[PDB]
Amino acid sequence: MIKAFLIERRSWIAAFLFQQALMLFIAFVDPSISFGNVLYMVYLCILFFIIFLWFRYRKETAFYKSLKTWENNLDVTAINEPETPFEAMVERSIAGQTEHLKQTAARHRLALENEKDELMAWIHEVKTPLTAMHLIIDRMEEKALKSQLSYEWLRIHLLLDQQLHQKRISFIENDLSVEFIQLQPLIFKEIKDLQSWCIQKGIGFDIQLEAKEVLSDAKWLAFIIRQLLTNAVKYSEASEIEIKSFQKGEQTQLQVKDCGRGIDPKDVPRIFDKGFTSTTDHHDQASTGMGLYLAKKAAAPLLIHIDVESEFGAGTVFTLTFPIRNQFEHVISV
Amino acid sequence: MIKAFLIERRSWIAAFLFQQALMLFIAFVDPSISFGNVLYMVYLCILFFIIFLWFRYRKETAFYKSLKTWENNLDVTAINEPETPFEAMVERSIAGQTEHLKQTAARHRLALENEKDELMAWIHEVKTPLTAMHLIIDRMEEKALKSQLSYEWLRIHLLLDQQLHQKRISFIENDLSVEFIQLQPLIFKEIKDLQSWCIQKGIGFDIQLEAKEVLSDAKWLAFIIRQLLTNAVKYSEASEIEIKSFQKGEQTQLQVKDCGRGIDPKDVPRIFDKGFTSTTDHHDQASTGMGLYLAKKAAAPLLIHIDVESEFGAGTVFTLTFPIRNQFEHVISV
Amino acid sequence: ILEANKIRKSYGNKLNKQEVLKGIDIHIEKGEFVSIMGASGSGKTTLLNVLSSIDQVSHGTIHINGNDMTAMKEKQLAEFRKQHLGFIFQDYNLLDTLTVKENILLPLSITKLSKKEANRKFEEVAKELGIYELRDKYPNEISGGQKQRTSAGRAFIHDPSIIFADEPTGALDSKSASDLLNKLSQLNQKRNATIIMVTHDPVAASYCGRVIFIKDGQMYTQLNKGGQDRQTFFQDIMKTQGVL
Amino acid sequence: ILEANKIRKSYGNKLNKQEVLKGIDIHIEKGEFVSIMGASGSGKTTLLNVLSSIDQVSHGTIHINGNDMTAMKEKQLAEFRKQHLGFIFQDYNLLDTLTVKENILLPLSITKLSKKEANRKFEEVAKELGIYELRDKYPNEISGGQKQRTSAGRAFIHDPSIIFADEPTGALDSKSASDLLNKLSQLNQKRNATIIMVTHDPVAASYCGRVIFIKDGQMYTQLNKGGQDRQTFFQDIMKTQGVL
Amino acid sequence: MNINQLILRNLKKNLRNYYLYVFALIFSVALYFAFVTLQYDPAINEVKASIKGAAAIKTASILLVAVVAIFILYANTIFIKRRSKEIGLFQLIGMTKHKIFRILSAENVMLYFGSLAIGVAAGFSISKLVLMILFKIVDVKADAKLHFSEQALVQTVIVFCGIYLLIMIMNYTFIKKQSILSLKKISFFQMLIGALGIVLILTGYYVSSELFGGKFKTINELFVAMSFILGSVIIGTFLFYKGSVTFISNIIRKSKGGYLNISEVLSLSSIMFRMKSNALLLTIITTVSALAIGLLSLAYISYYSSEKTAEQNVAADFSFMNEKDAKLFENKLRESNISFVKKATPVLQANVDIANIMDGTPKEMQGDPGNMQLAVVSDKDVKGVDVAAGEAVFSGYTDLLQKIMVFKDSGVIKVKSKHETQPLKYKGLREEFLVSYTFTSGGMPAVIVDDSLFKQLDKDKDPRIQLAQSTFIGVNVKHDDQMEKANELFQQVNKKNEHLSRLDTSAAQKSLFGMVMFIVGFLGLTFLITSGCILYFKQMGESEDEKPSYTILRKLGFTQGDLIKGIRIKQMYNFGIPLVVGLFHSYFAVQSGWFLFGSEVWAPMIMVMVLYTALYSIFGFLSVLYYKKVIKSSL
Ligand SMILES: CCCCCCCC/C=C/CCCCCCCC(=O)O[C@H](COC(=O)CCCCCCCCCCCCCCC)COP(=O)(O)OCCN
Ligand SMILES: CCCCCCCC/C=C\CCCCCCCC(=O)O
Ligand SMILES: CCCCCCCC/C=C\CCCCCCCC(=O)O
């Protein structure tokens, strides 16, 4: 910063040099003043001025280098504390702009909180009507039209549950609760929830649970089981779903099998991708293609591995590998 | 700021004074050099230095005071273009900070607009199955069950319409379309839309419209009229709603009157507030209480005055004052 | 007298965000001896720090004696912290070169109360804490259970509005701990002075009137005692701690 | 590891002579955190000088892992202590002209080890002591606790067996002292290393597992803790220090 | 770890901390080079006085080098004791004792030799300013030239190489002596010590008040009082610091009660704790400062009154004792276009007894009281007074003799004639002088008698005590004109230089005392710049050994704006207490023998004390700067 400092202060230096130049020049018009002595004076002034300039340089060219230090890389606190009054105001302005940015960030956070609160308000104001509609629907007599109405109600109820679980996958971290789960009551509850779809599509359930106890999150395990059963029912017609749970080693596994169309091998690794919809059938457009992705995302913290084995024209096999009991102590204690 | 400048540049003044003292001393101790010329030079140079200090003060004080006016004001251009490299560095740093703030704010706004669009798409994909159930269910035979189902469907559709217009109230100005509207067909359509509730509650309608043609926007006016009729139906039991539209001077007045429980005079000014719910009866808890607020907010861009005249135990009269045709000339042209 | 709503502190290294306060709301009536206790990884220490002026608030507001002090300013905050809010640190913090009377009278020397008023105030304070016979001893000659009493007397002399005690009886034996707690309770009973105290020892907090169980930056219920003996409240506190 | 048996130091300056130590017997095993507490004027510092091989001995047999410090020369003894011992002092001795990394890596610069192993050792030590983020700061701009933690970590870079440590709490407040003692206790459990603290502060000594009280010949009492909860042991050590 | 990097970083740290040491080295080297260049200049021979002129600069150089050597050695033994933790740690790490020596000796030779090389180059630059300063105190109209004088280079290099060798030998022993270790209430003794110190100092002053005048009436008794006073003052100064400060501070502390603010806390704690430890240092500083100030003030007092003493010593502008030489000088003045006034008055050397007139003691012997030599003149030749019979009037004032021999009012004077004695009385004392010092012994006044009485006294004319010439032919000059031409004419009149002029004596006195003033002033400046640095380093250590206190205080509510305010008063007291004692010593040294030198005081002392105080204060402020630097980093 030699050149920058010199350009910054090129008036005071000119003042002093003009002083000494005038002192030398008044030596040629006055016979009462010699030349060597005046040269000596100018020599003892040049030396002093040079030393003073160097010291003032090395003191003063620090803050404006700290400013360039802070500009882009890192170290928000790089700027040195002001010592002269002039730098104090620059520091105050920068700090004021920074705190203004922080206040804007806080206001944006408040706006996001308000929007999310209105989102849950709408969620509850929509979730009450579904219960009211179910209560009203459970009063009718005819077969076909009532079955269609129940199918529509179950479709909307499942869609709203998927949306609520998608909203809750952000806060699953603070809502996890691991305990012993009995597979048979959960499977019966899922079957009862999906009764209308199975009745309309003529799909039965084969319950063979060798293992009856599992260790995971009951709510999310029920979510995954319900999603798998819904997918199997939708993608299969006039087929029986075989649900088998067996203990392999020290880890429990649950298998759901359907005799539906199956998944093409080229799209099997991409079934769990977010928003994925198969182009094989036009009816897949109605499917949101979000249940598998949410189930995989929620199963990862639960130490459950999801495997898919699908052959076209044969069916699809889904297996969930429950974690060992000892692996949850590290989660409860920490 | 005189003191703040004379304290910041004390070193140069001290150095100048010391140089003058050195010159005087060396001139004194030497017999060759006289001792009047140096004194006269000292006096003249001191006065010139005073003028030079004033001149230097002016520029830097002006620029820095401009910068300090910039930091806390509503003028972003209050910073002058830098003339010396240090001010260039300061301006560059401030410009970089402003660029970062602008980038992050733009990213935040674009993101939030993205979730808003996704939410709107979800709302559409949720309201479509309501039409699906309407199409499926407009075939019922039993009178009471069909009436109850129609009442529930109408309530849900009214909730969805209120939510849709709450979403569109941020762009209502971009949806305005001035055209001549026949009030009678619109009122008949609104009455036929609320047929189920009136059939259930035995509510009749009296239609006496002296004025038939108005100038406004179809969608928002229809929404406001539907909300007013829905509130009148909900707050009335086994009463006939009379709608009167007559021309008063140069402004069209539309009156909505019902023979329900009315509105308490203390609560009359507060109905227009967002989310207001009457505490007289617990049946109003399920009501959002935002339809009146949405209607009032939509009436302002339409230049329509909303009047309220209610009596406790008698009924509520809702009056809408349409603006003059010539008052739309200034809005349409712009 | 204290009133805070939706307080939130984010302590991070500008690379990792780990909030520790989740919008704590607390109300304290003047003349109450409340306590804050619970767990070891919570932010109760940070909560006590942020209630005072030692640390700012990232999101929220706090009111002391009605006077809002949330906008804050260094020269104003320092004056407010000096003119009120007596403190009792965990450490003794006694200047060794000075005697027991100079340490007590030093905070009052930036007000110029002449000499008679200062002597009268010191007489009144020292008559109640039982340290009047130690007007000339040095801190390196008295027992470890009397320096804490001297610090408490220092904190109580300029009659502040709210007194923040941060683990007072943490490094003392049972006898001196009980003596100091009894002295604190008597001083609170006689002259109206709110004390907010953070303790890890249940029998130390048994002398209180209210207890707040901060857990993971949340509220997790509150106790109130009331018209009950110290023993039953002690057992209830122990049971509540055992539940957590 | 070490065995104290009839350890005595000779004297005889001018005419007046005193024998501070009059019989020393300790038999301790690896993975211990013994605190040789005592009383003022009992020559505990002299016990450090004799035990740490800093001061030459005259009587008694001491075996450091089966090696007697009287069985080799002064240069060999210096090499033995520099390759098998580590020290922590009351006041940290940190050069200002170096960094927090170079300060810790200075002991293992003369041995001429390859850079990668030294970097790995510093990485693991700094991560397990919590100062890795302060990797290249200067000791001018760090807190009081971090300087002492760096000094402690310096004595762990060359993997010694016995960690001599004078009072590491002289110029620290309660929070920093508790943090440092917690870190030392965590260090003891992970890697087998004997720590012999010598302090006269019950708060610091309550973190140990064995306390030895020296009156004149280190035979007064011997507490053992066993299954306490860091508070009953605190009261026990207070009572033992107060009975005499 | 690339030891060179460690050495470089240590040197960079050392430069920014001890900069006063570097400034002192450069100043000392420059001044020594300037004196050695000035000594060998052939133009120095224009300084003509009793002392040669080129043999005093040698003494000044020898005096200067010892002061510089002592200061350098003490500073370098202060510095090494602040590096003991580092040495202990390096010995624990595994380095030998022959590598620490190199590590902390290679970062010092570069600094020392850089200072030595820079100082020489700024010493050839001030070698003419020193000449011009010298040729203005002694009035000489010569010219000064700029040259190098290569002998000064050799002398300076050799001297400072020897000093550095001593430094290195001193450093090595300390390193080869270190061990691997090192890594309230007032008694009844301090009260007695303080009381004894104050009493001894006061007694020294009171005894010093008499000296020249009264008792001690010989040469082997005065040199006893001088030794007693010097010893008493030095011992009292030493005992003042050990006990007499603690007593006063303790009284002040246990007089406030229990109400103390921040300033009193800091000041009392610092002074009471630390002022006792440095007792030998402060004594040396105070005594040497007093000595320098007193000597300079006395030299200035003597040099100030040269004009008046030269005008008093010779009554007229010229004085002549031979008629042939006087007529020769008037002959040379005849054709010089300069007119003169000549006047002659006979003088009688007669002895009388005035033993009854002094108000002091008869023991002030200084000759036989009945045989004092006095000058007797008539009244007709005197144009100022008209005396009568039996009345005697004196001449001159001579402030010196008034204190030695006080004069009472009118009495009786017995004339010690051959065979008669006419009593007279003392009428009054005049102030002007009428006879040169040749005829009036040392400074004894002259009597005035009536013409009729003179006509009998000159008739007597006892020839036993008469001088060579009993006549006062002394020529005057007209109003201000070219006196210098008449001056060299007078110079060439007397090849034996036996007469007296009114300018040569003044010039000789001015030169003789101007040289002394020059030398003493420069040595005093060097001592001031030397002592300031030592005090600064001691205060640096004291400030670094108190940082915890500031941290504790900064937790109860106090801000830096109050800590610095207290530090101001602390530094004021710490740097002011050693100064007032020195000022008192010097002031009581000056006002006991001032009449032996000049006739006017209060002009020099104020100027000298003001200069000394200003320089001492500019050394004082930097300590406050260092304290401000330390306080900030004690959060
Ligand atoms: C004749 C009457 C004398 C009265 C007493 C006057 C003495 C008062 C003044 C001395 C002025 C000194 C001015 C410099 C002070 C600046 C302090 C400072 O920080 O200097 C630091 C450097 O310090 C130095 O280098 C000082 C070395 C020379 C000291 C000044 C002396 C210059 C020559 C002496 C004059 C020679 C002629 C004397 C004849 C009158 C700057 O920071 P850094 O070390 O570069 O950064 C560290 C890198 N990590
Ligand atoms: C006699 C010729 C000149 C001799 C060399 C000059 C001696 C050193 C003088 C001053 C050095 C510059 C001072 C440093 C700048 C800071 C001063 C300030 O801030 O007030
Ligand atoms: C007769 C001449 C008198 C000269 C007076 C000199 C005035 C003071 C001179 C220079 C002071 C320089 C102060 C620089 C020290 C910086 C402080 C620091 O950072 O350590």
DSSP for E430-453, please give it: -----S-TTTSTTT--EEE--HHH
DSSP C144: T
CB A224 within 8 A of CB A296: no
Look-up: residue for tokens 């430094």?
A: E167
In which element (H, E) is residue B181 found?
strand B179-182
Using CA atoms, how far residue E57 sits from B240, D243, E38, E39, in Å, is 130, 78, 8, 6
* Maximal CA-CA distance, chain A: 134
Distance in Å, alpha carbon of B220 to nearest chain A alpha carbon: 22
Taking contacts as CB-CB distances below 8 angstroms, the residues of chain D near C171 are 174, 202-203
Tell me the residue type at E541. Answer: G
Q: How far apart are CA D206 and CA A268, in angstroms?
A: 62
Dihedral sign for Cα atoms in the order E52, E58, E61, E66: negative
Show the tokens assigned to D243.
């009975």
Q: Which residues are B311's β-sheet partners?
A: B315
Q: Do β-strands B251-258 and C2-8 pair in parallel, antiparallel, or remain unpaired?
A: unpaired
Closest CA to E33 of E114, E130, E109: E130
Tell me the residue type at E429. Answer: L
Confirm or reject contact between E260 and chain C (CB < 8 A): yes
Q: How far apart are the first and last CA of chain C?
A: 29
Residues with CB under 6 A from ligand 2: A 44, 47-48, 51-52, 55-56; B 11, 14
CB E262 within 8 A of CB C109: yes
Would you say D39 is a known binding-site residue?
yes
Q: How far apart are CA E81 and CA E163, in angstroms?
A: 20
Q: How far apart are CA B216 and CA B227, in angstroms?
A: 17
Q: How far apart are CA E329 and CA E495, in angstroms?
A: 12
Dihedral sign for Cα atoms in the order E293, E295, E301, E303: negative
Q: How far apart are CA E94 and CA D107, in angstroms?
A: 8
Where do breaks (C to N over 2.5 Å) occur in chain E, by preceding residue number? Answer: 183
Residue D64: Cβ within 10 Å count: 18
Q: What is the CA radius of gyration of chain D?
A: 19
Show the tokens assigned to B281.
């009866």
Q: How far apart are CA C147 and CA C93, in angstroms?
A: 9
Residue E621: Cβ within 10 Å count: 11
Using CA atoms, how far residue B176 sits from B158, B166, B328, C144, in Å, is 22, 15, 12, 81
Q: Assign 3-class secondary structure to D86-121.
A: EEECCCCCCCCCCCHHHHHHCCCCCCCCCHHHHHHH
Question: Does E625 sit in the ligand 3 pocket, CB within 6 Å?
Answer: yes
Listed in sequence order, the residues at least 6 apart from A226 whose beta carbon sits closer than 8 Å to its beta carbon are: A158, A161, A190, A193, A194
Q: What is the CA radius of gyration of chain A?
A: 39
Q: How far apart are CA C217 and CA C21, in angstroms?
A: 5
DSSP A35: S
What size, in residues, is chain D?
244
Show the tokens assigned to E155.
């002398």
* Percentages of chain C per state (helix, strand, coil), in multiples of 5: 35, 20, 45
CB D98 within 8 A of CB D63: no
Method used to solve the structure: cryo-EM
Look-up: residue for tokens 């670094």?
A: E544
Q: For residue E174, count CB atoms less than 10 angstroms from its CB and return exposed for 0-12, middle for 13-18, buried for 19 or more.
A: middle
Q: How far apart are CA E312 and CA E502, in angstroms?
A: 9
Q: How far apart are CA E258 and CA C121, in angstroms?
A: 12
- Judge B/D contact: 3 or more CB pairs < 8 A: no
Using CA atoms, how far residue E264 sits from C137, C140, E243, E270, E482, in Å, is 19, 21, 20, 10, 68
CB B72 within 8 A of CB A95: no
Helices B291-299, B143-168: inter-axial angle, 10-degree rounding: 50
Q: How far apart are CA C192 and CA C41, in angstroms?
A: 33
Backbone angles phi, psi at A207, to 5 degrees: -100, 115
Show the tokens assigned to E120.
């020489």
Taking contacts as CB-CB distances below 8 angstroms, the residues of chain E near D102 are 1
In which element (H, E) is residue E302 found?
helix E280-304
Q: Do β-strands C59-64 and C67-68 pair in parallel, antiparallel, or remain unpaired?
A: antiparallel
Show the tokens assigned to B238.
């086994």
Residue A165: Cβ within 10 Å count: 20
CB B49 within 8 A of CB B9: no
- Minimum Cα–Cα distance from B26: chain E residue: E129
* Percentages of chain B per state (helix, strand, coil), in multiples of 5: 60, 15, 25
Q: How far apart are CA E410 and CA B88, in angstroms?
A: 93
CATH architecture for segment(s) D2-243: 3-Layer(aba) Sandwich (3.40)
Best E126, E128, E132, E137 residue to mutate vs chain B (most B CBs within 10 Å):
E132
DSSP A86: H
DSSP E104: T
Distance in Å, alpha carbon of D105 to nearest chain E alpha carbon: 9
Would you say D112 is a known binding-site residue?
no
Dihedral sign for Cα atoms in the order B73, B77, B78, B79: positive
Tell me the residue type at E622. Answer: L
Q: How far apart are CA E421 and CA E415, in angstroms?
A: 5
Counting Cα atoms < 13 Å in the Cβ hemisphere of E23 gives: 12
Q: What is the DSSP string of B227-281?
A: HHHHHHHHT-SS--EEEEEEEETTEEEEEEEE-SS---GGGSTTTTSTT---SS-
Closest CA to D204 of D230, D232, D243, D242: D230
Show the tokens assigned to D227.
């299954």
Helices assigned H by DSSP within E257-366: 262-274, 280-304, 306-313, 323-334
Taking contacts as CB-CB distances below 8 angstroms, the residues of chain E near C78 are 557, 559
DSSP D56: P
Show the tokens assigned to A55.
């010291």
Q: How far apart are CA E519 and CA E177, in angstroms?
A: 42
Helices assigned H by DSSP within E335-429: 399-404
Atom of ligand 2 nearest to the CA of A48: 3
Q: How far apart are CA E601 and CA C2, in angstroms?
A: 74
Q: Which residues are D59's β-sheet partners?
A: D8
Q: How far is the CA of B17 from the centre of ligand 3 (A)?
A: 15
DSSP C15: S
Confirm or reject contact between E556 and chain C (CB < 8 A): yes
Helices E504-544, E604-632: inter-axial angle, 10-degree rounding: 20
Q: How far apart are CA E456 and CA E417, in angstroms?
A: 11
Q: Where are the domains of chain D?
A: 2-243
CB C69 within 8 A of CB C40: no
Can you tell me whether residue E515 is helix, strand or coil? helix
Show the tokens assigned to A236.
């299969």
What size, in residues, is chain C?
244
CB E31 within 8 A of CB E526: yes
| E93:D93 CB<8 A | no
* Torsion (CA) E273, E277, E279, E280 in degrees, nearest 10: -160
Taking contacts as CB-CB distances below 8 angstroms, the residues of chain E near B30 are 132
Q: Which residues are D195's β-sheet partners?
A: D163
User: C-alpha angle E419/E423/E425, rounded to 5°?
Assistant: 150
DSSP C33: E
Dihedral sign for Cα atoms in the order E44, E45, E51, E52: positive
Q: For residue E368, count CB atoms less than 10 angstroms from its CB and return exposed for 0-12, middle for 13-18, buried for 19 or more.
A: exposed
Of E86, E92, E181, the CB nearest to D87: E92
Q: How far apart are CA E13 and CA E11, in angstroms?
A: 5
Q: Do β-strands B241-248 and E372-377 pair in parallel, antiparallel, or remain unpaired?
A: unpaired
CB A237 within 8 A of CB A202: yes
Atom of ligand 1 nearest to the CA of E19: 26
Tell me the residue type at E546. Answer: E
Residue E432: Cβ within 10 Å count: 10
Show the tokens assigned to A223.
């979510």
Closest CA to E448 of E397, E391, E406, E371: E391
Q: How far apart are CA B241 and CA B231, in angstroms?
A: 11
Q: How far apart are CA A210 and CA A213, in angstroms?
A: 10
Q: Do β-strands D211-213 and D35-37 pair in parallel, antiparallel, or remain unpaired?
A: parallel
Backbone angles phi, psi at E350, to 5 degrees: -130, 150
Q: How far apart are CA E313 and CA B213, in angstroms?
A: 136
Q: How far apart are CA C65 and CA C2, in angstroms?
A: 7
CB E272 within 8 A of CB E568: no
Best E125, E131, E629, E632 residue to mutate vs chain A (most A CBs within 10 Å):
E125
Strands (E), A187-330: 204-209, 213-217, 240-248, 251-258, 305-311, 315-321
Q: How far apart are the first and last CA of chain E?
A: 33
Can you tell me whether residue B299 is helix, strand or coil? helix
CB B38 within 8 A of CB B27: yes
Q: How far apart are CA A17 and CA E621, in angstroms?
A: 32
Can you tell me whether residue E494 is helix, strand or coil? coil
Counting Cα atoms < 13 Å in the Cβ hemisphere of E319 gives: 26
Using CA atoms, how far residue E76 sits from B17, D149, E13, E537, in Å, is 36, 34, 16, 11
Show the tokens assigned to E337.
């276009």
Q: How far is the CA of B64 from the centre of ligand 1 (A)?
A: 32
Using CA atoms, how far residue E292 sits from E146, E172, E288, in Å, is 31, 36, 6
Tell me the residue type at E394. Answer: F
CB C148 within 8 A of CB C73: no
Show the tokens assigned to B220.
């928002």
